[PDB]
Amino acid sequence: MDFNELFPVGTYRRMVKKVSVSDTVTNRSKALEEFMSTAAFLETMTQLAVEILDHKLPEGFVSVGVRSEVHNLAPAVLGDDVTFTVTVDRVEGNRVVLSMKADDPHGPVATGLQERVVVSTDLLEKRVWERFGGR
Amino acid sequence: MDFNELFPVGTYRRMVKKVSVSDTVTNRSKALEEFMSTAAFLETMTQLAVEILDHKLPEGFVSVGVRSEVHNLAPAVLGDDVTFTVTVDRVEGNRVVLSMKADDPHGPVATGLQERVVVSTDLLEKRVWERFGGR
Numbered sequence: 613m614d615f616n617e618l619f620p621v622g623t624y625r626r627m628v629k630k631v632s633v634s635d636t637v638t639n640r641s642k643a644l645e646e647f648m649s650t651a652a653f654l655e656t657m658t659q660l661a662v663e664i665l666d667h668k669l670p671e672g673f674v675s676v677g678v679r680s681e682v683h684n685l686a687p688a689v690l691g692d693d694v695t696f697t698v699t700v701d702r703v704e705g706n707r708v709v710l711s712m713k714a715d716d717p718h719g720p721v722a723t724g725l726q727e728r729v730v731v732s733t734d735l736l737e738k739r740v741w742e743r744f745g746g747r
Numbered sequence: 748m749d750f751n752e753l754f755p756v757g758t759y760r761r762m763v764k765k766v767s768v769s770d771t772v773t774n775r776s777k778a779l780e781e782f783m784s785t786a787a788f789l790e791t792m793t794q795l796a797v798e799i800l801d802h803k804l805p806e807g808f809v810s811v812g813v814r815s816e817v818h819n820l821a822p823a824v825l826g827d828d829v830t831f832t833v834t835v836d837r838v839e840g841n842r843v844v845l846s847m848k849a850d851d852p853h854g855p856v857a858t859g860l861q862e863r864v865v866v867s868t869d870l871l872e873k874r875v876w877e878r879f880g881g882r
């Protein structure tokens with residue numbers, strides 16, 4: 613695999629996410645029920661990053677998240693439609709760093725980044741097995 | 748309010764979180780259904796940060812998340828019990844930065860940080876109202 617080839621810098625996908633109660637409750641604070649939580653921004657970033665990368669990987673390989681960061685800029689209220697844009701920023705080794713911007717009709721609401729690693733599904737399964745096995 | 752007084756550096760809370768299907772589906776990848784997602788780590792960090800700060804704030808004030816970061820270290824499989832420890836790292840202006848560590852019986856699974864801002868609930872409500880009002 614040549615990840616520089618499979619994932620050119622600047623490659624992007626978008627989606628529009630409507631803010632719903634399941635996207636706010638994850639604020640874990642009744643007082644913040646009106647707007648989208650950081651966890652929701654992260655989940656949506658993850659979804660798009662997987663949509664960009666995984667179908668470009670050969671059979672037996674997937675991506676896994678190893679670091680995420682989100683900056684909140686402004687509230688995305690319940691019923692808002694938030695456009696997420698996730699873009700390949702750089703490739704290094706078996707990792708891809710993607711940037712994220714979330715906007716609505718009134719302007720930017722959040723930014724982010726996510727680093728993902730390409731793994732063998734077989735080796736991933738074995739890692740999980742070994743970790744939770746016997747001493 | 749003297750946030751240096753209300754939130755001494757090193758102040759912490761813990762909780763234990765069992766990894767369930769709702770904590771993995773947020774990987775947004777069928778292949779990753781076996782272990783806890785980054786969004787789940789973030790949600791739990793948020794919950795603890797709010798449990799540390801908000802009850803120490805006077806009537807009319809709450810905290811809001813403005814930046815989060817998570818580093819995944821190792822898989823927390825379905826059925827694992829993950830102990831989260833969230834700790835006040837520093838105070839600056841009207842903000843508190845907290846660190847996070849997530850561990851299970853086999854060792855560390857994730858680390859993180861979260862910066863939260865103290866806001867007036869009234870002013871927060873007005874911000875949301877104004878943003879989504881008329882041009």
Ligand SMILES: [Cl-]
Nearest residue numbers: 677678679785
């Ligand atoms: Cl991640």
Ligand SMILES: [Cl-]
Nearest residue numbers: 686687874878
């Ligand atoms: Cl605003």
Ligand SMILES: [Cl-]
Nearest residue numbers: 731732735736
């Ligand atoms: Cl691997």
Ligand SMILES: [Cl-]
Nearest residue numbers: 744745746747
């Ligand atoms: Cl054993």
Ligand SMILES: [Cl-]
Nearest residue numbers: 650812813814
């Ligand atoms: Cl946050």
Ligand SMILES: [Cl-]
Nearest residue numbers: 739743821822
């Ligand atoms: Cl491991």
Ligand SMILES: [Cl-]
Nearest residue numbers: 866867870871
């Ligand atoms: Cl405020």
Ligand SMILES: [Cl-]
Nearest residue numbers: 879880881882
């Ligand atoms: Cl208008």
Ligand code: NA
Nearest residue numbers: 632633634635
């Ligand atoms: Na929903």
Ligand code: NA
Nearest residue numbers: 767768769770
């Ligand atoms: Na659950």
